[PDB]
Design a protein around this ligand. Structure first.
Ligand SMILES: COC(=O)NC[C@@H](Cc1cnc2ccccc2c1)c1ccc(OCCCCCc2ccc(NC(=O)[C@H](C3CCCCC3)N3CCC[C@H](N)C3=O)cc2)cc1
Ligand SMILES: COC(=O)NC[C@@H](Cc1cnc2ccccc2c1)c1ccc(OCCCCCc2ccc(NC(=O)[C@H](C3CCCCC3)N3CCC[C@H](N)C3=O)cc2)cc1
Ligand SMILES: [Zn+2]
Ligand SMILES: [Zn+2]
Lengths: 959, 956
């Protein structure tokens, strides 16, 4: 009926549990579209994906597709204002982003459901009439340069690019996609290159509709969205641009049978094994790479990892298919290395080849495939509802590779068993086709080459033919066996009827000296899943640095020992997490409820009757020592946040204290620790999901009985159940703690204005001021003043106390940052004074909607409940109570609050700043007038600082 | 001049004693000792009448005690009753008195400038006392108060019960305290005028010939002679023959008798007594001291060692017990285990076996010689005594020894008399034994009740078969005589005062492992040193279990080291070792000579200690009963104990500790000790006859002994955390209520928390406490008659302070609250009205008290140790704080009360603890009080309030 529509796709295959409605169609200009109708959604979204990226970049400008990614969303003929799209989405509780890959430039946003047409109209105009405003040319270069400079000191980005540089330089795969100040400014200036004209050349030659895909999600019907997208996207130019393909592999003979020795930033030992393979995409209905990745990357009994671990060579492994570009892919086998693993690289690889050879001897297995196909079927069926912004962005890219009807089922379903394709792929995984890379600090001052884009230090060798022959002739290994029938595969998906005694919030169904049990039966999602949360309290887990180290190692060793068993459950959508806390231990079991008690039983049984293997203990003790030293390689803002937590909490063991006390951790001392730690405990739990009241009680009893029987567990005294207090800062006080980051040449800062103890009134005073200043903070400090890559503002909540926080990572000294934040606070006071009641009520309403936002998955609901339980505040109806009080708030109340608590001259001001210096550092112009800042009290000793100040009380519970 | 009957020869003193002495007998028969000490801060005098309670008329019990109370209540020269106490209060003085069975000792101290003034008031009570009728009823309520206090005390209960089981016609059977019944109720019923009987007794017994006067002053011996003659030569001589009681109060019918007594506390004791002749005459030889030393010995081969080894007894006390002139006793008292209580006959057999070993081996001259040598050293290097107690003690012993031997008397032994040792030993036989067993296992199984205390007991005759068994006691090979004591000091060298010596302790070491404070003694010059150590460990108080483990570890350590340590303790080298809320405390005191040997053994034992399973179980049981036994402590103590739990950050209760005790196993304790000693911090004070280098060597030795045997590493500074005081809110009032199940008396503690300690805050509080001190006693105790215990003063804990009131009364706690509140108003008025002259008198009185210089090393060390344990280190505090006190005004104090303590103060921080009586249900105008916040749960109360900072240390 409509000439603007080429074809309306048939039924879009979806999960029976999916209530969202789908319509697929192709427009006359060649745009592939998917319309998502969700009358339930709080946020409406859209995405456009151009099948052009950084592999198409011109030789003259490296990072041009990525620079276009920035320059395209700056002004349009309909909306000449550069920041229109950004402002509209900010004004209507939205957000936007984009990314550039080698073959795609994806653009996306979300907005309040009532404003889809307005946001989409602004979005569509960039694909119709862009202007590329010459005024933002230099700031975008700096935004792209800031992105790369952040990546430069990242080990993964370094490796990613070093791999690209060690392939065929004549191949597009070797291109540097990010760009920088050099590639976008310095170099084009020297060569008399017109950056804007080269950008427009690129835009006009590649950005065509035939290579585009659109996804629109909203409350509006399928037909209303069909009209909206036709109106907005049938006018987009169709220059019939051919799809860029790369059939030739960037890895030719001279790039095979090669060995690379790389120097990292962090003290990490890793082995990377790669095989170039053809492009397997077209075989998505059988997916041979997934079959082989499942087996090679298996962690159960008889796996390659198991043997490599037993040999004491590796702890972790990753195996499978890795995307390349249209025409090529890679097969990887990635492992970490123990000190002995680094010495037995050749041996490890021999074992890798022995496992690959076992699969050849055994041949493909239909039963392994049946499990994989059946599991993905259950996965797709009971899958959680997606965040619309990520959902659209994802589908936009997927539309290019699959028929309209298969874009939901694409990466989930398996149909045909193709053992011939498995045999085809497995045949490329051979020693004459291997590329080997070792990453070790031991290569420092022993390297001859440099990757210039990042500065990575490496050496390259050709692998001796005698090493290749040993891998080819590799003898059989009986330790390697194919996995067994996965008994963890779920079968019972019955949604237990909603009980007569069912409550809207978690109810305390057990209250004893040993345990406090909070339970809720899911009354919203109705998926066969549940979340089991346990917090085990012991004063012996943080009494001193030694015991803290021992509580860490205990649980690392426990997860390691349970790994081979737990893996099968993980594959069957049942996962667990076990971490030590500053009060004891945390256990979470998520996923399908069916086989959930079995894994829980095993976890607690292992906990209570743990037999430590000396070899594992020594390997894990070494890796934890490295992990301690590796904190220095973390970013300055991350360090700043770590120092404030130390400073502000009553008891807190530093990384320096923990590593000093690690040497004293012996195997008998640890063997003595476990019964002592488990001798006396309090357990506080939350069991939420597809469970009944009597089932939750039986779970808790099983947990109790296992600890009582095997560990001889007894409860703790209520006087022993004590939490740490926050430091109480003095009125009109300002303290500064300074430290240096030795890895990065940027500064870090956290500015904390401590207000008072949390309450309905105090929370909403702070949250309203935070709501008001939120967007301006980013546009001022980040966009206008260009302070740093990281600019953050919001409430800080710790130990029942709260306040206002500012986190910034800049190239400018922390003391300059101090004066800028202070000027901004004055501007915000002016803004609140000057703003209208209409603009003020919009803030109260924006915050109110965010706080009343319904959780969209069970885990999101449980996380809200868990927060109230771990804070011991138990205010499950918080949002309603606090939103009712917020609506009564006046402009003058926030002005008074600022005047008394936050202002430079406020009578009750409590400012504490943490300054993290850059690697090389030492300690008008139409900008806001910064006030006069007093002399800070410089903190020299964390203990003396705490000893000289009072500590706050602890917040009283609701229940 | 002729008023002196004779002047004694040289008064034998120590060459180390710089004080001058003069003895003389007055014409009226008064024996006198004069002490000339120009350096003395306080001067003192004491008069002792050799007549006591054993002289009371049978129809008026406690009359001698009553005369003591009525004597110092006005005279002809000084008619007002308040005169004497008032005079001493105005001139930095004090006074007290005690009545025993044979003596009435009256004594005082005053400023060294006001000796003549004070002694003149004192002297009149021995010339023309008035005995004011106004105080008759108040003094009876005072004597009745003292007896009612002792009524629930197990030691006073036994003391009287023993006296109720002998010859009733013997003066020893007398109740010497008296009460409202014996001094008021019964005499009125019998038509006895107590006043005339009081005057009768005083006339008959208060004779100068039975009196001894001791005077200590800055004044010369010649000037002291003139003063004591001027005042005491007029005391009338009634020529009273000194009473004697040579019959033994236990005649044949009272021998071979078994007594079964019910206690208040869950205690188990065995008392074995032998009536003996009055050995006082043999004081130069002293055979009772000899046998006491051997029978009571705690070293290898001793009676105790075997009784411990068998698992029957933990402790033993042996030797002569004083009776009166004419009779004495020889005792062997032990405590019992659950098993000792079932093996009493076996314990006494073992006692008799040991006695027989002393017979078979005969007397040892070297044993006597060692005692002689030890008393010579102990007399020579005797610490300087506070004048008040020094005069009091001499006034008593003046009666017993010649003038010249009054100081050496209780010390020096001369001739070895094996004949006497055989004579005394011949009395230690089963035919002459008396046995008493104290145990709750007798509750409901007794027939008699002691009338004065209500003590429940049974009397039995020891069977002839049991006596015969004990008589036939074999020789036991387990008993061996003690060996030569290798702890006897020989090196008495006083090291020269170093060029770099300091007046206060100096920080001579500040490492991660230890903080060492040192001071060479520049005051006393006796061959002694005090070695104090604080060991910090987060594992000594992490939970109630570790706390019990810390207690038991040191108790077992002290137990195991006892046989070795006793020899040192006899040789004047004692030690203390106890668990703290932060770790452990060790103190080594006495003669420096053998001091590092003992300290090396204690530190070695700490680390290489091996636990005996039998002792562990025994000590564990002893500690479980000790926790329970707290229920029998006074209600005011209970009230003090609860406020320490309420106001401290972390504090494990007696209930939590006793609940944790069953989890203390032997493998658990063995795992704990290596763990506790693994990481330590030591804070020490080494004060005495030592050099800087000697101190450093001592600290290094302690550190190295721990490093070697325990692999000790230092803690992190971040781990050296001290508990905080709960910060009370402004205008707040919290009440905590409990009950005392044992006592029918109420206990209370009222705390007005002020602020953190600082020069200004300390002196505000201390000056306010000075002003209200006597009035609090006079109003609430004397006038209102609230109770025996009425206390007011500053409270100091965790760098914080405030005002406190402690009252033990039979009246309910809420009443005391309003009466204390009424008193606060009364003082608010009293301060506004008092003169500048009256105000300055309070400043001077506090200044004098605060500047009162220590008389011995121990007292100086204690002052320094207090500065160390608080982590304030303000050694020059007393000078600084007094200088500031002298700048304070009546206005400054008025401001402080109105802001912090007044019923309507803006910053009033009140917390009260109420401990009700056993039976209890759950005048100036008192102000209106708000409704208090009742503390249900101690932890929730603590969680709901903030915590104070910790006081900043005073740096050099
Ligand atoms: C993309 O960036 C790079 O190219 N980086 C370069 C190399 C490092 C390198 C290499 N060679 C060089 C040669 C010369 C010079 C320098 C060199 C540098 C690199 C770095 C990191 C890196 O990260 C890994 C993720 C890569 C994503 C693909 C993938 C996903 C999942 C799985 N597999 C799994 O998650 C599997 C499942 C697969 C599907 C079936 C079920 C199993 N499973 C699950 C969890 C763990 C388990 N053991 C396992 O196995 C495999 C691939 C990849 C490559
Ligand atoms: C004062 O109160 C009473 O009398 N109460 C009565 C009885 C309990 C009783 C008894 N029998 C009864 C019969 C029938 C009915 C009721 C009865 C009740 C009692 C209670 C407590 C009591 O307390 C004990 C002290 C009593 C002082 C005499 C003394 C001092 C020191 C030493 N001996 C030592 O200090 C010796 C040294 C002596 C000198 C040379 C060196 C050794 N040494 C040192 C310390 C420890 C060591 N094991 C030791 O041995 C001996 C006696 C005394 C008596
Ligand atoms: Zn970018
Ligand atoms: Zn009295």
């Amino acid at each position: 009926n409509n000439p603007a529509i080429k074809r309306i796709g048939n039924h879009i295959t979806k999960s029976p549990e999916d209530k969202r409605e789908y319509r697929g169609l192709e427009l006359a200009n060649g745009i592939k579209v998917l319309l998502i109708s969700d009358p339930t959604t709080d946020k409406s979204s859209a995405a456009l994906d151009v099948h052009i990226g950084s592999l198409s970049d011109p030789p003259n400008i490296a990072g041009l597709s990525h620079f276009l990614q920035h320059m395209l969303f700056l002004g349009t003929k309909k909306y000449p204002k550069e920041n229109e799209y950004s402002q509209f989405l900010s004004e209507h509780a939205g957000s936007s982003n984009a990314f550039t890959s080698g073959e795609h430039t994806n653009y996306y946003f979300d907005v309040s459901h009532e404003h889809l047409e307005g946001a989409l109209d602004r979005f569509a105009q960039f694909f119709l009439s862009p202007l590329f405003d010459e005024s933002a040319k230099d700031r975008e270069v700096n935004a792209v340069d800031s992105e790369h400079e952040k990546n430069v000191m990242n080990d993964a980005w370094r490796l990613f690019q070093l791999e690209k540089a060690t392939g065929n330089p004549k191949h597009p795969f070797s291109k540097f996609g990010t760009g920088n100040k050099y590639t976008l400014e310095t170099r084009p200036n020297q060569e008399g290159i017109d950056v804007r004209q080269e950008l427009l050349k690129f835009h006009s030659a590649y950005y065509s509709s035939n290579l585009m895909a659109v996804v629109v999600l909203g409350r509006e019907s399928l037909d209303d969205l069909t009209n909206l997208v036709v109106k907005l996207f049938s006018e987009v130019e169709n220059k019939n641009v051919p799809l860029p393909e790369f059939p030739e592999h960037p890895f030719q003979e001279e790039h095979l049978k090669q060995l690379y020795k790389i120097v990292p930033i962090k003290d990490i030992r890793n082995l990377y094994v790669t095989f170039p393979i053809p492009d397997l995409q077209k075989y998505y209905k059988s997916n041979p790479g997934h079959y082989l990745g499942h087996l090679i990357g298996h962690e159960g009994p008889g796996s390659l990892l198991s043997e490599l671990k037993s040999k004491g060579w590796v702890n972790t492994l990753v195996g499978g298919q890795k995307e390349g570009a249209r025409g090529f892919m890679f097969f990887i086998i990635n492992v970490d290395l123990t000190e002995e693993g680094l010495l037995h690289v050749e041996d490890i690889i021999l074992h890798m080849f022995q496992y690959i050879q076992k699969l050849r001897a055994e041949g493909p297995q239909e039963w392994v495939f049946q499990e994989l196909k059946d599991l993905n079927a259950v996965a797709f069926r009971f899958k959680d509802k997606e965040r619309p912004r990520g959902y659209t962005s994802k589908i936009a890219g997927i539309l290019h590779y699959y028929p309209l009807e298969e874009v939901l089922t694409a990466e989930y379903l398996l149909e045909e068993f193709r053992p011939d394709l498995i045999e085809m792929v497995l045949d490329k995984l051979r020693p004459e086709n291997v590329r080997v890379a070792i990453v070790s600090k031991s290569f420092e001052g022993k390297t001859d080459r440099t990757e210039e884009w990042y500065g990575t230090q490496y050496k390259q060798e050709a692998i001796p033919d005698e090493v290749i022959k040993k891998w080819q002739n590799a003898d059989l290994n009986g330790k390697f066996k194919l996995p067994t029938k996965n008994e963890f595969i779920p079968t019972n998906f019955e949604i237990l009827p909603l009980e007569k005694e069912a409550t809207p919030y978690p109810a305390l169904i057990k209250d004893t000296a040993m345990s406090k049990l909070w339970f809720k039966q899911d009354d919203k999602f109705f998926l066969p899943k549940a979340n089991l949360n346990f917090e085990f309290f012991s004063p012996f887990a943080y009494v001193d640095p030694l015991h803290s180290n021992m509580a860490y190692l205990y649980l690392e060793l426990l997860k390691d020992s349970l790994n081979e068993y737990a893996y099968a459950a993980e594959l069957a959508g049942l996962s667990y997490d076990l971490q030590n806390t500053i009060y004891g231990m945390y256990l979470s079991v998520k996923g399908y409820n069916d086989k959930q008690p079995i894994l829980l039983k095993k976890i607690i049984e292992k906990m209570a009757t743990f037999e430590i293997d000396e070899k594992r203990f020594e390997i894990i003790k070494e890796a934890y020592m490295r992990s301690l030293n590796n904190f220095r390689a973390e970013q300055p803002h991350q360090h700043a946040m770590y120092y404030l937590r130390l400073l502000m909490t009553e008891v807190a063991w530093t990384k320096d204290e923990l590593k000093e006390a690690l040497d004293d951790v012996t195997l008998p001392r640890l063997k003595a620790f476990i019964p002592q730690l488990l001798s006396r405990l309090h357990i506080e739990a939350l069991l939420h999901g597809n469970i009944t009241k009597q089932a939750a009680l039986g779970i808790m009893q099983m947990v109790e009985d296992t600890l009582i029987e095997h560990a001889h567990t007894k409860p703790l005294l209520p006087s022993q159940l004590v939490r740490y207090r926050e430091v109480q800062l003095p009125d009109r006080g300002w303290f500064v703690y300074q430290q240096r980051n030795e890895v990065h040449n940027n500064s870090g800062i956290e500015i904390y204005y401590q207000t008072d103890m949390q309450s309905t009134s105090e929370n909403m005073f702070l949250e309203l001021f935070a709501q008001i200043i939120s967007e301006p903070a980013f546009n001022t400090l980040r966009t206008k003043e260009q302070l740093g890559y990281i600019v953050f503002s919001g409430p800080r909540r710790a130990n029942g106390i709260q306040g206002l926080r500012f986190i910034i990572q800049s190239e400018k000294p922390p003391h300059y940052l101090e004066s800028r934040v202070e000027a901004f606070l004055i501007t915000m006071e002016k803004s609140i004074e000057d703003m209208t009641e209409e603009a003020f009520q919009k803030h109260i309403q924006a915050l109110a909607i965010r706080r009343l936002d319904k959780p969209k998955k069970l885990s999101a609901e449980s996380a809200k409940y868990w927060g109230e339980i771990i804070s011991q505040q138990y205010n499950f109806d918080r949002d309603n109570t606090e939103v009712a009080y917020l609506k009564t708030l006046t402009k003058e109340d926030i002005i008074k609050f600022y005047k008394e608590m936050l202002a430079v001259d406020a009578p009750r001001r409590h400012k504490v700043s943490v300054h993290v210096l850059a690697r090389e550092m030492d300690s008008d112009i139409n900008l806001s007038q910064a006030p006069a800042l007093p002399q800070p009290e410089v903190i020299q000793n964390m203990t003396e600082f705490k000893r000289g100040l009072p500590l706050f009380p602890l917040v009283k519970p609701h229940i």
